[PDB]
Design a protein around this ligand. Structure first.
Ligand SMILES: [Mg+2]
Lengths: 276, 276, 270
C-alpha cells in the first residue's frame, strides 16, 4: 500500500513518459523512481520472481527502470586514466567497507555493477558486468568477462563461466527476462538470451548460444525444445543436418539429464566427462 | 594545401620511420602526426570510406597511426586501484562534460576508447573497447565486452552485441579494415575480422566467426563467398561435411536474405525464427 | 633448501587449513604464504615449468596460492567511479616508471593483473585480465578481453587474440595449469581450459573451445586427441556426426600439421 502507492506513481509517470525529462520531472516522481531502483538494488524487489512455480514478470518494475533513464541526465564520471559519461550510477560508488563486510560478497577489480542490481551474499564478481534490474542470488560465481544483462534473474549457486553472457530484457515490458535457475552451470563463452529460462541444475557447456529461436535438440527423444532448458539438462554445442546432408546448422544438444543439485566446478567437469 | 602538407609530412616521415624515435622526432613531424590522430579522433578524417559505392582505404592515415606509436614513449597511467603503462593516450582523459554533452554519445563505465577513434552522436558504448583509428557512426550500440579494432569502420544504427569483436587492421597498409555497414545486427559472441566487409542491413547471429579464413556458405545457392557478407544476409553458424561425411568443419551460413533498412529487434528476433 | 623449508611450511599450513582464517592466521604462516606469492610475482618461482622437456607442476605452489586467499580478508579497493572489495592485491598498484621501464612490457588500460602473476619483457597486455599464479613469457600479445587464468603458463611469442580465455586451474589441486607453449597463435573468441596443453607453434582458429572433454579430431589419421594440441597443429572448429547422422556435436579438427603467415594456414579448410 505504501508499495501500492509507489507503483501508482510509477504507472502514472510511465503513461506520460513521452513528456518526462530530467529537467521537468517533479520531485515526488523522481524520488519514487529512485526508491524503486533502491529496492531493486537491495533485492527487496525483483523484476521477475517465481510465484507458485511459474516465473512472473512485474511490468511495473520494468517501467521504473525505464523511467530511471528518462529522468536522469548523463553525467561525467571520473575514471582516473579515463572519463565516462552516463546516466546510471554505479552500485558500489557509495558502499563503504562496513556495508561490504555486512553483505558478504566479493567484487574483484575491474568488476562493476549498475545501481539497481541485486548481488547476494557469497557471490564472487570476477571482472564482469551486472546491468540494472538484475538479481544475482547467493553463492553465485560470475567469471571473467561475464555479463548479467538487464533484469536477468540468476539463482543461487549458479556458475557463469568466463565470457558467458546472460541477455538483458528491458523492453518489451511484457517480456520476461532471461532466467537461470538455482544450481545451473553455464560454461565458457556461452550466451543465454531473450528470456530463455534455464531450469534448475542444468549444465550448459562451452560455446552454447541459446535465444528463443535456438533449437535445443533432445537426442534421447528426438524432440526440439525452444525457449526453455528442462531442469537437469546437460547441454552442449551441436548442429542438425539439412535434409541434404550437404550442410548443417548450429543448435544446442541435450546429451544427458541429471538430478538438479548444487555441484562444484570439479564435479561439473567430471560430469561433462561422463557423456557419450 | 594544408591537408596536402600534412599527408606529405606523414608519408615522408614514414619513409624514414626506422630512424625516428621518441627522443629524436622534430616538433613539426610530431605535431603533424598528433594532428592527424586528432582529425581521426574527431571523425574529420577516417581510415577508410565509401566513395561511389566503393570502400577506399587511405594508407597515409594508417601510416600516421603507426607513427603515433613510434614517436611516443610508454608512460605510467594512474588507474586508482591499479596503474598502467602504455604510449597511446585515452580519448576521454581530457574530455570535459560540455564536450561529452555536445558530442551526444554515452560512455558506460568501464568503457574506454583510445585517442584517435571517432564516436558519433547517439551511440552507446557499454563496457567495451574502441581502438585507435576506428570510426563508430551514429546510433550504434556497442555492447558489453565488445571490441571495435584498430581502423574498423562501424556504420550507423549498428548493433554490436555483447562479446562481439570487430578485428583491427593496420598492416598491411593496403588492406581495407573490417567494415560493418549501416543497419547491421551482430549477435553475441561473434567476431568479424581481417577486413571482412559485412554489407548493409545484414543480421549475423550468435557465435559467428568470420575472417578471410572463413567459408560463407549460401545455403540458398550452394555458393561459398569469402571476405564479404552480402547486404541483407541472415547468417548463422553451421558446418560443411567432408566428402566422406566423417567430419564437418565450421562455416558461416547465409540462411536467407532481407531487404536492407532501418530496424527494430522485434524484426531481428522474428527474422531468425523463420530460419531452418 | 631454504626453498625446501619454505615448501614444508606451506604444506604443513595446507594440511591444517581448515583451522586457518584471516582472523587467526599467525605471522610465520602468513610470511611464508606471502613470500611464495612474491616469488611468483617476480617469476623467481612458477607454478609449472618444462623440465627435461616435460611439464612439471608444483602442487605446493598451488597450495600457497590457494592459501593466500584463505588467510586474507577482503579489503575495499577505491576505483575512481566504483569501488571493489576483494582479498588479492593488484600487481601494479605501486609501480613506478622505473619499474615498468625495467620489466619492459606494456599494460594497456584498462588491463589489470593480480599480484602473484609474472609478466615478461616485450609482452603487451591489451585490455585483459591475468590472474594470480600465471606466467606470461616474453614477446607475447594478450589481446583485448583475453583472460590468462590462475596458474596458466603462456609461452614466448604467443598471440592470444581478442577475447581468448585460458582457463584457470587452481583446483583440482593436482591438475597442471592450462599451458600455451611457445610460438602459438590462438584465434579470437577461443577458450582453452582445464589444463589443456597447446604445444608449440600451433595455430588455433577462431571460436575454438577445448577443455578436457573436447574431441580434438585429426582428420588425416582419424585420431582423436584429448587434452593436448600436438605441436604445429592447425586447428579449427567442426563437428563429428552421430552414428545415424541425426545430429552432430562440437569438436576441434586438426586440419594440418606444420613444422614450426597464419591466414594461409587457415584459409585452407576442407
Ligand atoms: Mg578503472
Amino acid at each position: 500500500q505504501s508499495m501500492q502507492q509507489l507503483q501508482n506513481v510509477i504507472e502514472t509517470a510511465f503513461e506520460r513518459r513521452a513528456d518526462i525529462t530530467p529537467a521537468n520531472v517533479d520531485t515526488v516522481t523522481r524520488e519514487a523512481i529512485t526508491h524503486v531502483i533502491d529496492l531493486l538494488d537491495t533485492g527487496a524487489l525483483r523484476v521477475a520472481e517465481k510465484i507458485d512455480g511459474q516465473w512472473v514478470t512485474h511490468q511495473w518494475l520494468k517501467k521504473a527502470v525505464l523511467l530511471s533513464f528518462r529522468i536522469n541526465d548523463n553525467q561525467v564520471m571520473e575514471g582516473a586514466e579515463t572519463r565516462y559519461y552516463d546516466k546510471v550510477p554505479m552500485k558500489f560508488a557509495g558502499y563503504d567497507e562496513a556495508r561490504f563486510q555486512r553483505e558478504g560478497f566479493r567484487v574483484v577489480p575491474p568488476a562493476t555493477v549498475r545501481k539497481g542490481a541485486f548481488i547476494a551474499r557469497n557471490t564472487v564478481l570476477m571482472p564482469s558486468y551486472v546491468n540494472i534490474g538484475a538479481f544475482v542470488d547467493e553463492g553465485t560465481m560470475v567469471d571473467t568477462w561475464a555479463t548479467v544483462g538487464s533484469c536477468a534473474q540468476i539463482g543461487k549457486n549458479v556458475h557463469l563461466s568466463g565470457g558467458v553472457g546472460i541477455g538483458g530484457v528491458l523492453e518489451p515490458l511484457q517480456a520476461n527476462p532471461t532466467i537461470i535457475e538455482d544450481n545451473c552451470f553455464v560454461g565458457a563463452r556461452s550466451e543465454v538470451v531473450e528470456g530463455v529460462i534455464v531450469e534448475e541444475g542444468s549444465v550448459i557447456s562451452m560455446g552454447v548460444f541459446i535465444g528463443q529461436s535456438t533449437r535445443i535438440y533432445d537426442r534421447e527423444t528426438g524432440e526440439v525444445h525452444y525457449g526453455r532448458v528442462p531442469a537437469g539438462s546437460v547441454v552442449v554445442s551441436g548442429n542438425l543436418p539439412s535434409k541434404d546432408g550437404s550442410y548443417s546448422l548450429y543448435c544446442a544438444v541435450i546429451v544427458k539429464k541429471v538430478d538438479a543439485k548444487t555441484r562444484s566446478k570439479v564435479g561439473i567437469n567430471e560430469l561433462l566427462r561422463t557423456i557419450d
